[PDB]
Amino acid sequence: KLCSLDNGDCDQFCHENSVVCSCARGYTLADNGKACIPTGPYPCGKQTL
Amino acid sequence: IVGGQECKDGECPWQALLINEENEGFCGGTILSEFYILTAAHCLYQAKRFKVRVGAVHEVEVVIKHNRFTKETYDFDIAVLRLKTPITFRMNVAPACLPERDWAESTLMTQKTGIVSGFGRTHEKGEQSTRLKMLEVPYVDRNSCKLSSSFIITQNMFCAGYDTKQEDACQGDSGGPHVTRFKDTYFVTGIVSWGEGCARKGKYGIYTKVTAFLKWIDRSMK
Numbered sequence A: 001k002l003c004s005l006d007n008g009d010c011d012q013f014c015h016e017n018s019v020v021c022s023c024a025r026g027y028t029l030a031d032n033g034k035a036c037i038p039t040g041p042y043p044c045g046k047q048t049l
Numbered sequence B: 001i002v003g004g005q006e007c008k009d010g011e012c013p014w015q016a017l018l019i020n021e022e023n024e025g026f027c028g029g030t031i032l033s034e035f036y037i038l039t040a041a042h043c044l045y046q047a048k049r050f051k052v053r054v055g056a057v058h059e060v061e062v063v064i065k066h067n068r069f070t071k072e073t074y075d076f077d078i079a080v081l082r083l084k085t086p087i088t089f090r091m092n093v094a095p096a097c098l099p100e101r102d103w104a105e106s107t108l109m110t111q112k113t114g115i116v117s118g119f120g121r122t123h124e125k126g127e128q129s130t131r132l133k134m135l136e137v138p139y140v141d142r143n144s145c146k147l148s149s150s151f152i153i154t155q156n157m158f159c160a161g162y163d164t165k166q167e168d169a170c171q172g173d174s175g176g177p178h179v180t181r182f183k184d185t186y187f188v189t190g191i192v193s194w195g196e197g198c199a200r201k202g203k204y205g206i207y208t209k210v211t212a213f214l215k216w217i218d219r220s221m222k
């Protein structure tokens, strides 16, 4: 239910009650439990800018 | 790539190129990590010997091709290459993300479009591109695709592209990336697999469905 509406406000992975967000390898879940923060200069899936 | 546009510098950094002994490209790949490249199993039959170019040239240590690959249907068209020397990430050289399977099925595969890229032919009966190109391809309804196709479409394949509009991947792009953008992050969703010609009317591009192989990929990268 909840992940099917704007992805539960998660930046990346959403699972369900309540919403639980997670992130790909090389990212850390932000304090807000929604956003995904890179750990290095070349995280996966980002264009190089 | 027929149609689409050239990638800006840094816009398509996960692209790899498989090159023969004379430094001529014949297939694409996707950077997954410093040591691993995703490509199509059918690309393993295109040259006697090959290496991988990013952006630097890297030799292959191990070829891990799917045990169920069939040349007749292109079912299970997936391989992973482990490189002898690690890739240095830098401008134009960075990996695409591997999604979680459940989320990828429910959320990525249900986006309207993905992005295919490569150095392959710019017309079915034309020449390869010197510059890297990209193309946004709509996901295509499975029933629509089965209706269009002279050959079997399995659960390990999906279709993307256009019915009549003259844009598609082509010879020399195969093995290359199909990625899906989700809030500015690009996830691996496909491998350029096959098509009946390139950009033909009433025909789509056919892609290896990566969601079917996420466990297999994790196992192969250990």
Ligand SMILES: C[N+](C)(C)CCCN1C(=O)[C@@H]2[C@H](C1=O)[C@H](c1ccc(C(=N)N)cc1)N1CCC[C@@H]21
Binding pocket: B042, B071, B072, B073, B074, B151, B168, B169, B170, B171, B172, B174, B192, B193, B194, B195, B196, B197, B198, B199, B204, B205, B206
């Ligand atoms: C599935 N069956 C066996 C019926 C058709 C395979 C034909 N052909 C190839 O052999 C590969 C692949 C392809 O479709 C491939 C290819 C991949 C994608 C497209 C496209 N999207 N238009 C076209 C050709 N060719 C380029 C380099 C090798 C060949």
Ligand code: NA
Binding pocket: B161, B162, B163, B164, B165, B199, B200, B201, B202, B203, B204
């Ligand atoms: Na078409």
